Give the backbone structure.
Amino acid sequence: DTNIVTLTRFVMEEGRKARGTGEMTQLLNSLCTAVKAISTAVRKAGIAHLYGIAGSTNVTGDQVKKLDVLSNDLVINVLKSSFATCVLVSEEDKNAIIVEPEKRGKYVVCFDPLDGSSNIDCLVSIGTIFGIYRKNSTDEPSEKDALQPGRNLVAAGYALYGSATMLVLAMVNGVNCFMLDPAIGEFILVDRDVKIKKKGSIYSINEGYAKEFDPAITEYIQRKKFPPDNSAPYGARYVGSMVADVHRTLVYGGIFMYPANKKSPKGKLRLLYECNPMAYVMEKAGGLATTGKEAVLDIVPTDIHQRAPIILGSPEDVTELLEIYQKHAAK
Amino acid sequence: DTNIVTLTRFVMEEGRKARGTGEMTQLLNSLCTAVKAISTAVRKAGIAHLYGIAGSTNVTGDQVKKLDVLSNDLVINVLKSSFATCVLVSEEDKNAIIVEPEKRGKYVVCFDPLDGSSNIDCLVSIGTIFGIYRKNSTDEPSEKDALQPGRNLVAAGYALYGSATMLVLAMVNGVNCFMLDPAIGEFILVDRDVKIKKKGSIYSINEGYAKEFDPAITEYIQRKKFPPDNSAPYGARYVGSMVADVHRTLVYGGIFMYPANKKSPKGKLRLLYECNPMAYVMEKAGGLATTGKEAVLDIVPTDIHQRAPIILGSPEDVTELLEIYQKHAAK
Amino acid sequence: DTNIVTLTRFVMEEGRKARGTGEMTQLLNSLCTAVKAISTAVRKAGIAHLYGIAGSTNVTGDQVKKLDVLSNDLVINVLKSSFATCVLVSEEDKNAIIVEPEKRGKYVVCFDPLDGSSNIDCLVSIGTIFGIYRKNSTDEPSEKDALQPGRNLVAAGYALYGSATMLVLAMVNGVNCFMLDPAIGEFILVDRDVKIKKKGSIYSINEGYAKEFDPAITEYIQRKKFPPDNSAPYGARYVGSMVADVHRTLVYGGIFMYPANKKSPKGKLRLLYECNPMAYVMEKAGGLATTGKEAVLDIVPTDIHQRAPIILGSPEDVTELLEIYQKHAAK
Amino acid sequence: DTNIVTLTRFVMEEGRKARGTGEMTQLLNSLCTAVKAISTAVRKAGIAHLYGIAGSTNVTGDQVKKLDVLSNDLVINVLKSSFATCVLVSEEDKNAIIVEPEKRGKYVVCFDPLDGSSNIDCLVSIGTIFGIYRKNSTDEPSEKDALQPGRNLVAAGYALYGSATMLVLAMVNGVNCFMLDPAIGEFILVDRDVKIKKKGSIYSINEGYAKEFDPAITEYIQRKKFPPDNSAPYGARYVGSMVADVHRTLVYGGIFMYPANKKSPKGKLRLLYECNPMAYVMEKAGGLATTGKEAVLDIVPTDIHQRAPIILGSPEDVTELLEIYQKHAAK
Ligand SMILES: O=P(O)(O)OC[C@H]1O[C@](O)(CO)[C@@H](O)[C@@H]1O
Ligand SMILES: O=P(O)(O)OC[C@H]1O[C@](O)(CO)[C@@H](O)[C@@H]1O
Ligand SMILES: O=P(O)(O)OC[C@H]1O[C@](O)(CO)[C@@H](O)[C@@H]1O
Ligand SMILES: O=P(O)(O)OC[C@H]1O[C@](O)(CO)[C@@H](O)[C@@H]1O
Ligand SMILES: [Mg+2]
Ligand SMILES: [Mg+2]
Ligand SMILES: [Mg+2]
Ligand SMILES: [Mg+2]
Ligand SMILES: [Mg+2]
Ligand SMILES: [Mg+2]
Ligand SMILES: [Mg+2]
Ligand SMILES: [Mg+2]
């Protein structure tokens, strides 16, 4: 127990290959500090009276909670002091944040400081989602720098504050899970090179929107309940926090869906800091992530708070759904 | 912050009324120690390699996990040393456990050492469920002592290992929530005299069993999706761990269902250590808990591992469902 | 690791012999909560800005620190809610505290909320010292109830906030050490039936008072440095916190001295909540504790803040010193 | 509380001036992980049965304890994976450790994995001491690289596992203290640019060696007890762990002494990983550190396990002692 393989040691060794400026490690180390702070607050929110609203609404119209503010501040602050970022996109901020010249690095980070707001009060799993982009342009940093398609992601992942706190990280060569050791405050590698099953037996969606589902989702769900080949029906699971449902999909396999509907042409989840990071993790894990008409990572954003339909998980499950959408594709 | 209202102080003061032998406090204090031990292990299970099966099956046919064993042992051991119990019923033990004479107390405790096994590996919320019965008979303690209807419960509750660890406790006069303070290892009162909303807007059930649902559940679910009065459709939520889904139902209101079906006349959840404790908490919170034909707490068990259909939550939501069952009631 | 032997389980089993009202266990459990709270604050005092004075002076003329207040409040509050005490004597309170009728128990507790004030800022070991007396009289509880000689102690001990937090407890039959497990917030038995060595090789005293030492101490110290039989000279150790120096004396053996001097006829340490508890622990461990003229536990106090000279530790070391005092005894 | 100033952020900003390869930060971050691991083990050593010997002796003849091994391994391992060191000198290792080519950095680190062994069992303050040297030569790394005088130190400091865990760090421009926040596992700046008082009122030495003291120490101590100007005599303090006694000297001022004696021409404490780091911290804090004949940092080592007499602390106190040595200086 004297050779603890931390996220820092892990990243440094992998990055030892290309050998860069080393700010990605600074980026992640900074992010890990924020995640530990969030994990500690969430673990005792009730006692610290951290539940409740903050008395404000975000650009996407959500009722800002106190933990939204706290988590957002923690992440903003640590990312700035990392000397690794220049542009920051947060769900909680109307416009992109531009890092002061002195603390500027070459990365653009889009993040959801706290995902799963409806589940804060009921102690259900919540988390933090992030996507790292390397700044390509040469002109002054700005919002445009965060408007890159998910294919350009260099690193993505999420922190899961569940029965245990986990930091799932995906990079060019794969996905790794690190668990937070409460005693020494370190994320330790517990899962190496994670790969999602080709086909699962769990479908995850909010069926409360059945009246708005398009004929494709409606048919897919009916198929998971009444299999045509008389195979065992899929089990259903919907925690309510994207980070939780996606993580389960990653380790148990299956499918998670937050499609578009009669009232939401572009679904609900945000593309920059929700859809893209998960699509990226999913694809680096051998999975798929589609809107139902196109790969999520190939969408070229025009609004940092843009919404996108997302269907992701095991390739065979996602493909079965795409085939149905194609079957219903109209003029 | 120098007057910490712990579960111990709370119980002692309430019990200061009747003023008994004081072993209920010993019971709960002992239970709190086990819950803290479970919380700590779960928080770092991956790092401690606590995931995986234990290589055994319980009386109910589940694949025993390593945490099942650990949690079960911790609870068995602390309950024995409390000098407050005589008969113990655990999901993990084939037969009732009889406490040696020297350490015997007047309570019978039925418990689910670790609830939500399918969600262990994906870090989804899990917990511990318990029900305390006072031994009434005078003859040697035995299994029969655990075969009392839920109406006889003196105390019930559950530990929720979610984004935060909470100990929900219900007694004759009401329900209170205590949150575990990781720093000093104490459960502190965060929610006093909890009452569930008369009507919610969330339904919780595994729709993957649609092909087996009886006409009553089928109709109820269709109604939550396509309201006849054109009101907003209910939102759906199903974490997969009874403790998590029930807790959310308790604080957000709504309905949780694990009904009987074409293949499971008595549903799945166990009556002694799953259904009864939750039915009790639910009723002390002003909620309802039915099988769809009778109150859960009024069932007289004949098998400590007996299963029971359970529908619980907001009184108006549960009642709307009972009315439907009554509408379908056949000869 | 599923059978954790806590201080609570330990006390309950030992007390299972006589079998009393059970409030001693309530007393100790309450005290353990306060000690964990103090341990957590001290562990992060600098970060919580808990260092510094509180802007007040106690009856003994010390400059009250912020941790003095905090620790004092925590202990006062938990002892009151334990329903086990009636009179309380604290170093920080001018007069004895009388527990309101409703929360009254049969015990009198004298305590030093935080011992070793000079070592707070330098992060040197500090602690908490307590002495429990059973109320014998029948009239209204009052200060007089705390004016009993140490021989009347029913329980005594101290919490040591050092490299690790330890709770040393002595009762009629012996001494046991319990270590605080930070992860689950429980004191676990690590040392059973502790006995001090008959003779040590360490002397502990503040030699900065050499100019005031009486001929007895002066001669004793010279003897520890220049042994007459040419044996190895004693090693010297003086941490500055009674709890630390006494604990070391208990586990390594030797002698600790805070004698009277030309300017302090009654030494410095307080008899009620400093000298007596340690003398008691020391004697139950097979050690001795004298003023240099009489056993510390046999002094009948007349002032709850009374001071007393104290020399304690290994019987042979203490006796060698008594012989010297007797050699110098004058008309 | 959303802008936590950690040791990492602190070092990075200061180093932002010169702007180097950035491995010093990697060095320190790696070291901080080891220190947190040691702090956690020490906090629960008794419970983890970490007390006792390891069944071996070091080059300096000490009886190796289990924590010596653990701490040594943790430090060796993290320093290697930091990609910042090439030569390592540990009290526990007979010869210098040469870092494999792949993980080599430009720093040489001399360290005492666990200081204060005699105080392990009695829960008295213990710590970790380190000294960082930049490799100057160009030939293959070797032991010679660790044989530099303390004046060549680039960074030095120590971890103090006391009532709180503190990381004291000194660099070219000054000394800063960082306290470990147990909740998030981070060292936070609590003391900025620490400066020692010009004169103190506490002397720290093991007077048990009085029979071996040279006439200089003997006279100095007598002077601290019987001041010639009738000023208040100095208070005495000797915890037994260099890290603890030195830290107190740093924050309270005064003097700490472990001089040479009739049997130990070169005192006891080791120059490479004990004397130099403390002399460096002391001097960067405006203090002094002498052998009694020459500055400690100016000694050119010839043996990595070389011993050295050390007298350090407030400049006026140390100078008063040097004057006495000069008064006794013989042919
Ligand atoms: O309540 P709904 O509409 O199912 O939305 C739940 C989804 O919204 C979010 O809370 C938005 O952050 C996701 O975490 C989650 O997947
Ligand atoms: O996978 P299913 O059939 O929905 O069962 C889930 C239910 O079973 C349990 O895991 C049994 O403990 C409950 O915690 C949960 O509510
Ligand atoms: O500084 P002095 O006079 O040696 O006093 C130290 C003694 O005083 C106290 O700080 C009083 O609480 C003891 O803990 C300690 O033994
Ligand atoms: O027992 P002695 O000879 O006073 O030695 C104590 C000194 O030795 C050490 O334990 C050696 O590490 C120091 O920490 C301490 O200052
Ligand atoms: Mg969010
Ligand atoms: Mg979100
Ligand atoms: Mg279970
Ligand atoms: Mg269960
Ligand atoms: Mg005190
Ligand atoms: Mg004291
Ligand atoms: Mg050492
Ligand atoms: Mg040392």
Remarks:
- Residues A 235; B 115-118, 206, 240-242, 258, 268 surround 6-O-phosphono-beta-D-fructofuranose (ligand 2) (CB under 6 Å).
- Chain C touches chain D through 54 residues (CB under 8 Å).
- The longest strand of chain C covers residues 107-115.
